[PDB]
Amino acid sequence: EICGPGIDIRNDYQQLKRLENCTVIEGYLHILLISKAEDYRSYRFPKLTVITEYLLLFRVAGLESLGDLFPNLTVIRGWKLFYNYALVIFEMTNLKDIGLYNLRNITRGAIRIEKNADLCYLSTVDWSLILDAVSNNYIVGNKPPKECGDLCPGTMEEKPMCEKTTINNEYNYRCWTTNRCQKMCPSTCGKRACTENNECCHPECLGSCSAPDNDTACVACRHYYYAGVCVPACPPNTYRFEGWRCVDRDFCANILSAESSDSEGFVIHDGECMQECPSGFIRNGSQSMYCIPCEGPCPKVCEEEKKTKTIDSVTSAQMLQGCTIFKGNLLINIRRGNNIASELENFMGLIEVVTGYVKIRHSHALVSLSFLKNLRLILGEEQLEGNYSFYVLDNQNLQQLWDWDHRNLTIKAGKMYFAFNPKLCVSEIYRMEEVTGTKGRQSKGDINTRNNGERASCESDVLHFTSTTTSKNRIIITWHRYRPPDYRDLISFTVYYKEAPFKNVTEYDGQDACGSNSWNMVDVDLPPNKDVEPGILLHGLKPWTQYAVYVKAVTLTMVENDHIRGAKSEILYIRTNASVPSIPLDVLSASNSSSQLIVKWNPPSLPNGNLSYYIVRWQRQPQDGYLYRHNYCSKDKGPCCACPKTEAEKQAEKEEAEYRKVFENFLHNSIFVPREYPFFESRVDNKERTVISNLRPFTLYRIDIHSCNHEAEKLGCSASNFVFARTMPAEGADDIPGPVTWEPRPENSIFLKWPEPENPNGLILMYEIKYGSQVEDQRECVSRQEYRKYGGAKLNRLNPGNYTARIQATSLSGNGSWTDPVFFYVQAK
Amino acid sequence: EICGPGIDIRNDYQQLKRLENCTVIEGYLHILLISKAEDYRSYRFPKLTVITEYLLLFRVAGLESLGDLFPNLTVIRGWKLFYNYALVIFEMTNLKDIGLYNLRNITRGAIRIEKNADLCYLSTVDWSLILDAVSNNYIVGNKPPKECGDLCPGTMEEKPMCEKTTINNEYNYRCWTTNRCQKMCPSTCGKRACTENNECCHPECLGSCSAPDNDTACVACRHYYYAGVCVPACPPNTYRFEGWRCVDRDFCANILSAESSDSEGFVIHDGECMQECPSGFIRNGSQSMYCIPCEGPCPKVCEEEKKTKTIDSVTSAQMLQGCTIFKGNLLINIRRGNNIASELENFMGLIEVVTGYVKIRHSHALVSLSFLKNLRLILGEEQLEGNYSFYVLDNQNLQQLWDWDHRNLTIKAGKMYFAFNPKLCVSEIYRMEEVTGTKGRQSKGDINTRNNGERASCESDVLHFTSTTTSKNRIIITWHRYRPPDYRDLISFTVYYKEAPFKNVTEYDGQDACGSNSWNMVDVDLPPNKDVEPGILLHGLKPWTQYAVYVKAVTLTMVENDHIRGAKSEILYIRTNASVPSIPLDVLSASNSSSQLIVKWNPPSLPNGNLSYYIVRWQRQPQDGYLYRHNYCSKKGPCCACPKTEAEKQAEKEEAEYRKVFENFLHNSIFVPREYPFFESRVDNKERTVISNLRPFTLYRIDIHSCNHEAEKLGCSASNFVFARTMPAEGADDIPGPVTWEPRPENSIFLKWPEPENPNGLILMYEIKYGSQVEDQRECVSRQEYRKYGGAKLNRLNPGNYTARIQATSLSGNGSWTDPVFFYVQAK
């Protein structure tokens, strides 16, 4: 009586005649597009009790109340959701009552009940009792609440019979239709269910039951239904099916297929009989009782219902995402594209093996198939005419296949036929022959010395570098004077340069719209003097790298054609000290401890270089006499919520700013007629960090960070980029080192004298004398100069009596320690 | 004492020595970047009275009062503005009071006094009396208001001396500095001026004068100053110089230059001595007394300070926008660009002549130089080495220069050289020799059959179209079965197709990233059977365009290469009825008058056709009996609160596609294997027509077709349909005859009347209005009720006389009320 898989019904009522025996539809259910409205309440299915997956009702004409059609539908499990909902009521023509009065809970998903024509009573449904995470319930599009006439038994006239429940301060009746209420199981059950007239159900139960505390009496189980009993976990030797039941291996090979089905046969793993084994695991043959781990990324079969999965764009490769092996092939006909590779390395860069051919056709912007990294082997079962199991035709600007210095590839059951790729030189393919076990499998015309790399150029020689001068933003190099078979042939020398620090960059990574655009060319002609060799002076080269160099010539091929030799030199990697270095960046340092200072910086951005060694010059800086000569005792998707506009006139602003700047330039042109401490050095070795110690506790230090690199010797050092930092004051050095002395003076005056700190931190700015008779309220200031002149200070016109005093020093770092109590007295006479 | 042009000073006080004799600085003034702050109020310039243009002060250290430096500055004309503004005080280091106490008016532009550390006394400067359009002023960023200490004589302690003026409900004192107030001419003086002690000046005056109503006493008058006298208009034989004065033609020609100067010599136009004559007019030689109209676009010289304006991007084409003749030479080196042409037709499509070379170096994406349209002639004075005054090297994807069918191009003083165009067919250049008269000016190697079009390739033959089958949204075609010197050569036959109705299209408009990307290639090869000639069946055609197709031969070049012939067939234009037709769009109509109805529609987007003539079938429609059998008597946008822009739109796309495929498989497996005639009036060429001789108020059906050029052979297209109602017959709804009344028992009255002869649409009901004194009672009679009885009955009426009226309810609207019906009912 377990109907499955999910049932579909549309365009007629008679299709409901397939629901007499359905109690738990093991799947989803669709009752949709019933536009006839021919029949009425003659189809009744009390047997239906649960839908494992979501339910979809749509355009069901002639239907007024679902509860009549599908009663006893105790619970919807909703293991699979439509979008995220376990029930769909879309554009319901004439439903008045939601019904489902026996429906009690929804395990997974929300509901969409919108834009119906005559539905209400949704307000009377307290989904909180039925549904968890109800905030996703989407019922906005229905009738305004005013008109539908929310009433039902109890809340109309007759004695109330619906229970009273509260949501968000709404303690009122809950119900489903005009004929019945919405009861909920008492808190006496807690999470447990119950039956009519408040008889509470078994713990392992849900929806409803027939007898109190009986496993076999439950209408719907809570988690898993087996052997006519609801159980909390899957009994041993039995293995969970999808959703709501346990079951033993035998069928799990036997559930072969029925219309919509895959296996044939379901495998058991992790204690459950799933459709296919999870990731990182492999089904060993037709076994279904367990599943063994594979090892690597094997568990992904990329198969598609088609045979030749043809690709023509990035959007064409989305389906193949994160997949390794296909029972098929490739076919590209891209006729335009920018940054396409960076996408295809991601979508299908994981493809690893193919059972057939790999075909490339009429692709312009394809430059070098290095953008498909993981292909290792090709079987060739799915072959072309003539058993060509690896094809590339009319690939205009193709440059070269996957890197072949370290990577390997194999073709098992076929050959390859490259044609009409004038930029696919024969050197890249003469290596393919020896590697994929196909050297003699085919003839040479299949690897024709024609169109293959045709404009990939006769047979190029090498231009010999005569010398390599260099500079600090300006490479140089010179090379052999080119002498063709006929001197009139050659016309110039296109001189390449890009920044390839890492030797893994070949002459064909980025050339010009053929190989992409990375090697930013520039050219210069041979001098008219045949006695002066072709030598050039690049410039404008950003710092940091082997802005490499190599020489080809833009030459003339005709009449003799193949006899026209052309030339291409080797890929030299002139370096820095060719682009000789420069100055620092990002200078910083701090004082963690006294007589210590951590200095750190970063690899500077324009040192025209690569790391050799770093130097910082730190010099003690003066404590300015300006501070000494001052008496401080008396001295005293963003904001566009209110975006005004998006100025496409930024270009007009550009021109206006250019006009202003040029006006200021000519303005400048014509306004004026023709017009104590040593340096300490500690080179770092290779890092931009170092530490400085043996420093006075509270001295201000200047920190000259340099790019004194490998060529600091020849070309002198770089500039000295600088920063200054202070040290951490010596704790306890600010306290007064000696006792205070007091002497009497006339006019009831007292003179106070004391010593000065031996090692003040920075400088002593002032002294704060605190004194008084009973409480030291009086506070007066003494400057360092005032202290020097008198060795202290004077207090005049003090009242008779005894006194206690204290003194504090104000260091440049902060306040000092208070002096010990000073006891003195003044007599009236 | 008329210093000019504009004066500028910086970086030192000693440059202020250049203002002792300057009374009216005939230009702008810069006193900026004085960071020294060396001196103080020792430089005094009472003479300075007016600045013709804006005044800029910036970074003038050590200055606390501008009024001391530049007193008597009565008015600033501000003819030329800084940005839109006649005064800019930017980051004034220490200025305290603006001074300018003698300044009275600003003619053009506004002021910019912002972010000054120590500036004050702007709140008391009521710019309205000085300035027009005070709204744009911006003084938020300066010294904020709270401590500004805006006080001045009178408003502090002592007896008030500043006058009271009101702006936006603030009638209080105005002033300049702590020592002086803000005085202005009274309402007695009006727009017109005055001096101290309120002695009102002359009419043609401004700022200030010396004596009341005297031409020669004005300190700085209103509009124009000449011969020591102000005048309202520039006197005859004298010509207005820029801004504030007139000058005889002799001076207008004598002003050669002084450092910053253009003419050398100024020309006279419209009564004013201008730097250059305005647009559309030309200075005949060196004449300055007058300027004569030229004719066309001559008056715009494109000359640049540089000699070889090198072109490297669209941003490199802006400066020469809207320019016709360059006296130099131009170099394209764009290494990448999309839609660049469309831009350079506007930026540089107007250049016509050049006195020098045109050179193209290292341009990958340049495809056909047709986009530089206006270039007609090249003089060539500015030449390269070897007299190459028209040069092209390393244009990778060049296809074709300016269309040489109707376009002429000329070079006067040099030859031309083109190399490293692998895609420049020699047929594009062989005609150049005969157009610019340069056939012999250069050797054959100069326009060599070498590099020029090297992959413009060998030489193309032409195929024969054996037959041309065609279809209705889809093509077919065949051509001759070519036999090369060696059969193994050919590997496929290229099959282009685009939509080129206007026969002005060559194969090289947009081919593929070489010529741009327009001819959307797709290819099919020869069939295995040599007895079956190459045939093909394309698809994907958009309707209504005199379509385009052609073929070439894609060949293999080696061993002999040049002998590998290839081929190119003619650019055929398979057409409509080859792209056989389709069905209509955009049908509408309305009723302007009875028995008339205007019908209009649109030439469909899918006619697949040539306009030949349109057909409309209109049919009278029945009036539904449903209505008859019913008794009606009783019946920068939303982003002010923008939530987000879903970059997850791709994920939404996948979810939607998943749902659609789900529904597709769901559809697959749900079900196991399962009163009037037509009238026609063909339009001729337009999509409009009229239909007449129609019943006044009958609803019509309007079938509009694409029954077009070849509706003959393949029958008509679909018949796209709409309805439309006519205007009701005015006056046909009125009752045609009188009403009759009869007595009935129970004080009842029976009313009978005739029916409209030609009701408009249908008579739904009758509204009888009756009463004794006032016809208050209103009752309804249905059409069926009237038919059964010929009227209606009224029962239980009170005794007395009565008057009644009746109205009919037509489908178009209410009818006309009946004439008064007089009747009476007796109690017994």
UniProtKB/Swiss-Prot annotation, chain A:
Cystine crosslinks: C3-C22, C120-C148, C152-C175, C162-C181, C185-C194, C189-C200, C201-C209, C205-C218, C221-C230, C234-C246, C252-C273, C277-C291, C294-C298, C302-C323, C425-C458
Domain of life: Eukaryota
Known outcome of mutating Y767C: In IGF1RES; significant decrease in IGF1-induced DNA synthesis and AKT1 phosphorylation in patient fibroblasts
Extracellular side: 676-829
Effect of V75L: In a renal chromophobe sample; somatic mutation
Carbohydrate-modified residues: N21, N72, N105, N214, N284, N387, N408, N504, N577, N592, N610, N802, N815
Residue ranges annotated for the Fibronectin type-III domain, each copy included: 461-579, 580-649, 736-829
Protein name (database record): Insulin-like growth factor 1 receptor alpha chain
Organism: Homo sapiens
UniProtKB/Swiss-Prot annotation, chain B:
Domain annotation Fibronectin type-III: ranges: 461-579, 580-648, 735-828
Disulfide bridge map: C3-C22, C120-C148, C152-C175, C162-C181, C185-C194, C189-C200, C201-C209, C205-C218, C221-C230, C234-C246, C252-C273, C277-C291, C294-C298, C302-C323, C425-C458
Consequence of changing K115N: In IGF1RES; has decreased IGF1R function
Glycosylation site list: N21, N72, N105, N214, N284, N387, N408, N504, N577, N592, N610, N801, N814
Effect of V75L: In a renal chromophobe sample; somatic mutation
Extracellular side stretches: 675-828
Name of this protein: Insulin-like growth factor 1 receptor alpha chain
Species assigned in the record: Homo sapiens
